[PDB]
């Protein structure tokens, strides 16, 4: 029954800086509190437990500090290493209930980069399968925020079509969104001219960019 | 320092049960008390339960009691997690995991909540849906939209199932400036994933390019040809 909330849902900062992050408790879990560090499709990473204590092997950077309802795992001169999405474990309720929190990415802020939109048509032989996907491309920006909109003949139509963004990256360190139109064939066939729009926060001005089939 | 190893992931279907093995080796096993920890895709760890295996005793979480069960086998040391009547939402990674109690075996034990030692994590997907290899289409590069430098292009594997699919281009090679997108669930039960490359358009006509979709579960290798069309 105990919640485990993570305030800090998204947390950007950069490289060397100083990294905090707050896990907050329903009722009081004492001490038995841990730390996790999970990098994207990796098993997590016991870092600290016992609230204030770190795992045998792991970088004195990372602090933990906190008791009772109220855990920081506040992080000194952040890493390279150190992305990864940081969640807090509370394992003090008996019998065995524990819980954790929702968690916390520790993604590397840098500069606000607008976002190239390739709008890729579907391939004919696509089409002969018997639907058709727009791919509308967003690549290498950063605040992951960049709200995308299909129009379909100057149609606000939104519904089929999905988004996915792609982790922070290694060089680079931005993000790569991906929205995608599937429609039929006969309403592919329906429409002239599909547009995809984004507004990114990086972006001067919305850039629509589209195409007519053929 | 123990290493712990899980049994392979396995696509179950709607109303069944899942059983997912975790070899644990490198130390004295009934020292160890070992814990299921599942992760939906996107979402974030949830408890699962813990064994207290020296005392063959399990505690389980409240919204899966009775669905779920923990048992281990010290004979051949392997931890085991049982999950029957599987919705879709089950769908996720379960990771074994354990943490090391004191001289158990001497009646010593610290009785640990957090896990020190996970396993690899062993992927579960629950669908209605049935297992069938991927279709790849190219995504003409953008020769309308983008030049003067380089222009993307790349491909749309689309409609595959169960998870995961691995991509590279030119036979393994542009495996640079390439951002493969994760996969997304359509409606239909089934995956769709895209991967691009943005490369240099004075570059098309001359090398071929090919992104290499692999499907192991289907068991179906696919390549396609993505010609500057």
């Known amino acids: 029954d105990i919640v485990m909330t993570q305030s800090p849902a998204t947390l950007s900062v950069s490289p060397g800086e100083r990294a905090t992050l707050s896990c907050r408790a329903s009722?009081?879990?004492?001490?038995?509190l841990a730390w996790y560090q999970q990098k994207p499709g990796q098993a997590p990473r016991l870092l600290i437990y016992?609230?204030?204590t770190r795992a045998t092997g792991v970088p004195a950077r990372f602090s933990g500090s906190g008791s009772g309802a109220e855990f920081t795992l506040t992080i000194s001169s952040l890493q390279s290493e150190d992305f990864a999405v940081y969640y807090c474990?509370?394992?003090?309720?008996?019998?065995?209930?524990?819980?954790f929190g929702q968690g916390t990415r520790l993604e590397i802020k840098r500069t606000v980069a607008a976002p190239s939109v390739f709008i890729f048509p579907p391939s004919d032989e696509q089409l002969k399968s018997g639907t058709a996907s727009v791919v509308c491309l967003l690549n290498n920006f950063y605040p992951r925020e960049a709200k995308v909109q299909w129009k379909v003949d100057n149609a606000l139509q939104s519904g089929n079509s999905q988004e996915s963004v792609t982790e922070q990256d290694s060089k680079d360190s931005t993000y790569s969104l991906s929205s995608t139109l599937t429609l039929s064939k006969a309403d592919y066939e329906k429409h002239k001219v599909y547009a995809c729009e984004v507004t990114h926060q990086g972006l001067s001005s919305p850039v629509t960019k589209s195409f007519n089939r053929g | 320092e123990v290493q712990l190893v899980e049994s392979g992931a396995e696509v179950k279907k709607p109303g069944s049960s899942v059983k997912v093995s975790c070899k644990a080796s490198?130390?004295?096993?009934?020292?160890?008390?070992f814990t299921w920890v599942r992760q939906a895709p996107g979402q974030g760890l949830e408890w699962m339960g813990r064994?207290?295996?020296?005392?063959?005793?399990?505690h389980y979480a409240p919204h899966l009691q009775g669905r779920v069960t923990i048992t281990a086998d010290k004979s051949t040391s392997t931890v085991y997690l049982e999950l029957r009547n599987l919705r879709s939402d089950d769908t996720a990674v379960y990771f074994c995991?354990?943490?090391?109690?004191?001289?158990?075996?001497?009646?010593?034990?610290?009785?640990?909540?957090?896990?020190?030692?996970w396993g690899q994590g062993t992927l579960v997907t629950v669908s209605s849906a049935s297992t069938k290899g991927p279709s790849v289409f190219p995504l003409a590069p953008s020769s309308k939209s983008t030049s003067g430098g380089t222009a993307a292009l790349g491909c749309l594997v689309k409609d595959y199932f169960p998870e995961p699919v691995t991509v590279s281009w030119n036979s393994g090679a542009l495996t640079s400036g390439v951002h493969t997108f994760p996969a997304v669930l359509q409606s239909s039960g089934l995956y769709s994933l895209s991967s691009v490359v943005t490369v240099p358009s004075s570059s098309l006509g001359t090398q071929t390019y090919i992104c290499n979709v692999n499907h192991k579960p289907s068991n179906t290798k696919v390549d396609k040809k993505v010609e500057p069309k």
């Open positions: 474990q509370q394992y003090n309720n008996w019998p065995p209930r524990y819980t």
């Open positions: 016992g609230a204030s």
């Open positions: 995991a354990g943490v090391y109690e004191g001289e158990a075996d001497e009646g010593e034990y610290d009785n640990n909540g957090f896990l020190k030692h």
């Open positions: 064994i207290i295996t020296i005392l063959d005793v399990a």
């Open positions: 009722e009081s879990v004492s001490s038995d």
């Open positions: 490198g130390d004295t096993f009934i020292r160890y008390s």
